[PDB]
């Protein structure tokens, strides 16, 4: 062969296609409808146009099961997994790749975690937040007054 120069190279990395996030072994798939709602998983196999086999290794609370594709939301992350993997190899791969923990750093993961934190607050904690905001208001209003 003759290989590709840098010119062609970045040029490949500049074509932003309309469609990203394909269905394939490795996509991340937040789940949206049904009893396992609000949980993560992975595609491991596709049966038909509408039916898919889905598996979240023993890290997440979802077992290996068939699911209608329309209940899913594809995410940005993909793991590069093998031909016909089982759950055990998938756990090792997701552990050694650190993909779940860098979904946690994205825009959607941060807000999901913050909402969770806000849901188990206690009455004293709610008062503490209210008090802190009341304190911050005074500094806002003195700085604003000094400005004009």
């Amino acid at each position: 062969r003759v290989e590709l120069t840098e010119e062609e190279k970045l040029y490949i990395s500049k074509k932003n296609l309309l469609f990203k996030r394909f269905v394939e072994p490795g996509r991340l798939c937040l789940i949206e409808y049904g009893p396992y709602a609000g949980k993560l998983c992975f595609i491991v196999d596709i049966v038909t146009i509408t039916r898919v086999i889905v598996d979240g290794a023993f890290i997440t609370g979802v077992p290996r099961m068939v699911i209608p594709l329309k209940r899913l939301k594809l995410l940005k992350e993909r793991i590069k997994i093998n031909k016909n993997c089982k759950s055990g190899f998938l756990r090792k791969t997701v552990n050694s790749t650190k993909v779940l923990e860098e979904f946690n750093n994205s825009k959607l993961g941060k807000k999901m975690i913050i909402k969770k934190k806000r849901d188990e607050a206690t009455d004293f904690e709610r008062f503490q937040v209210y008090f802190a905001k009341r304190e911050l208001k005074k500094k806002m209003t003195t700085i604003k007054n000094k400005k004009n």
């Binding site: 934190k117 937040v129 802190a132 500094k139 806002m140 604003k144």
Partner: protein, 201 residues
């Protein structure tokens, strides 16, 4: 439905689905104001819907047409009539429900400075497959003698210009307030800052 008033702009909504969701709200008791009624959509070809209006036009009281069906043809009065046919408007309660609806073409003053809501359960983009045919209510009503389609468009141009200037000023204000916020975080006792950071405020 626990508010003094909801303002909807009807641009891009299907006529029947929107009319069915307004009527139940009115029956439960809620003032509703609907604007931009000329942008409502219907789910057939334009010719096919014009045929239906033509059929509606040829039924009248034979002995005296002053009575009988009155053929209203402004795009907002049409939504008014379609809503009226989903209510029991011949009882006192169902006549009270009908009087709580206000419809406009374009966007007059009191409401050009309010907040507008949409109903995703009735949006054309989410309900109608892309190879089907549809028409626009303003075009259909102009084809049967309404005569004001051009004037409202000319008015909407100016309304959008004024809104653009407002939006510019607002974005400047939010930036100028965010900088003040980020400066004032360092003047607070560490406990309040830590509790604010833990809950992401």
């Amino acid at each position: 439905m626990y508010k003094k008033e909801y303002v909807i702009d009807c641009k891009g909504h299907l006529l029947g689905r929107l009319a069915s969701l307004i009527a139940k709200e009115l029956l439960n008791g809620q003032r509703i104001v609907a604007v931009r009624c000329e942008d409502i959509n219907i789910s057939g070809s334009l010719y096919r819907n014009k045929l239906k209006y033509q059929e509606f036009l040829r039924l009248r009281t034979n002995t005296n047409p002053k009575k009988g069906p009155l053929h209203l043809r402004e795009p907002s009065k049409i939504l008014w009539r379609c809503v009226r046919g989903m209510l029991p408007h011949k009882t006192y309660k169902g006549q009270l429900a009908l009087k709580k609806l206000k419809v406009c073409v374009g966007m007059p003053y009191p409401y050009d400075k309010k907040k507008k809501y949409v109903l995703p359960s009735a949006l054309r983009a989410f309900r109608l497959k892309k190879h089907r045919r549809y028409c626009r209510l303003g075009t259909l009503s102009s084809r049967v003698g309404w005569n004001y389609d051009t004037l409202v468009k000319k008015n909407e141009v100016l309304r959008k210009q004024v809104s653009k200037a407002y939006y510019k000023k607002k974005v400047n204000n939010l930036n100028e307030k965010k900088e003040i916020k980020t400066e004032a975080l360092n003047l607070i006792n560490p406990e309040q800052r830590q509790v604010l950071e833990n809950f992401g405020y």
